[PDB]
Amino acid sequence: ARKSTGGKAPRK
Amino acid sequence: GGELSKDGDLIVSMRILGKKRTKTWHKGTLIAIQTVGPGKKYKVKFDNKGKSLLSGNHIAYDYHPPADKLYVGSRVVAKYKDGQVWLYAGIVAETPNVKNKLRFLIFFDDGYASYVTQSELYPICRPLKKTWEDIEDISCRDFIEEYVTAYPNRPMVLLKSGQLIKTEWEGTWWKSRVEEVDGSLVRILFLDDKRCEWIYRGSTRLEPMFSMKTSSA
Ligand code: NA
């Protein structure tokens, strides 16, 4: 039940 | 001019992987090498469909790395799984040890993270010397540069199964729960939607990590 990636750091 | 039959261990006729414009990688054959301008270009005929002229950072060998030959920062292609498998580029973030259960941690070019086995990754043939410099997403490029250069200094938070924290995702801080710890990753359940994400335990998307990094004296 995967969420799409949010990457490695918070959104700028 | 500048046609070559070989460039070191790259030989016309070898099996190879090439990067397509979709950012997925596909098996083919190296059909030509040519010196153009400042370097070499590599012509790949794909098994399924198409031909491409590629730079050396956009081809990978069709074999799996021997034990112990990759390093933190190595540029690789790795299996990405959704239900379906695709090959996507990334960077080695951790090499096999028992506590990661002898897997490689991969930070993919889009910021996704996963552990993969030795038989799930392929080495890129001619990476850039600073391997992150061909990462298109500037926020992932910057993160990788910081991570690789600081390694092995990796501040992480200790999280336990069942712990409740806020986790950032796309600009919002969401109520979330720690489901599982696996080496340097934590499986976070976002409570609003009940979907999970594996996140690096040193990521400032995890509020305890954000809090620690933001503090200062
Ligand atoms: Na260093």
Side-chain angles (χ1 to χ4, degrees), chain B residues 148-151:
Chain B
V148 175
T149 65
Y151 185 79

Side-chain angles (χ1 to χ4, degrees), chain B residues 143-159:
Chain B
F143 177 86
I144 300 295
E145 172 175 23
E146 180 185 286
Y147 180 91
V148 175
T149 65
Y151 185 79
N153 188 338
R154 296 192 298 163
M156 299 186 205
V157 292
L158 193 294
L159 292 169

Side-chain angles (χ1 to χ4, degrees), chain B residues 79-81 83 85-98 100 102-117 119-159 161-174 176-209:
Chain B
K79 295 196 187 183
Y80 170 73
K81 300 139 155 60
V85 81
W86 300 95
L87 300 177
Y88 278 100
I91 299 273
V92 172
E94 197 175 275
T95 64
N97 69 28
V98 160
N100 67 31
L102 299 175
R103 291 170 298 163
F104 296 84
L105 185 57
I106 305 306
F107 297 165
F108 289 85
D109 289 13
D110 71 344
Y112 176 78
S114 190
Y115 281 112
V116 306
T117 69
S119 66
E120 295 179 325
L121 80 179
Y122 304 85
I124 283 163
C125 302
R126 300 288 182 273
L128 301 190
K129 186 171 179 174
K130 280 184 169 182
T131 55
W132 55 82
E133 288 180 342
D134 61 2
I135 294 172
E136 171 184 281
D137 179 318
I138 187 49
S139 76
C140 185
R141 178 176 164 177
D142 286 349
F143 177 86
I144 300 295
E145 172 175 23
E146 180 185 286
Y147 180 91
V148 175
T149 65
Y151 185 79
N153 188 338
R154 296 192 298 163
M156 299 186 205
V157 292
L158 193 294
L159 292 169
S161 181
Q163 188 170 350
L164 296 172
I165 65 170
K166 295 178 194 316
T167 300
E168 190 274 353
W169 179 96
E170 300 204 347
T172 292
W173 290 83
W174 302 83
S176 74
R177 188 172 71 198
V178 174
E179 302 301 85
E180 190 176 355
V181 177
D182 184 18
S184 301
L185 302 180
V186 63
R187 185 160 56 88
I188 298 301
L189 176 70
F190 291 93
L191 294 168
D192 287 298
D193 63 353
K194 302 288 190 150
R195 285 189 283 209
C196 289
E197 191 183 358
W198 286 99
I199 302 175
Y200 172 52
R201 293 191 299 102
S203 173
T204 61
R205 292 178 59 218
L206 303 167
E207 179 280 339
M209 196 59 237

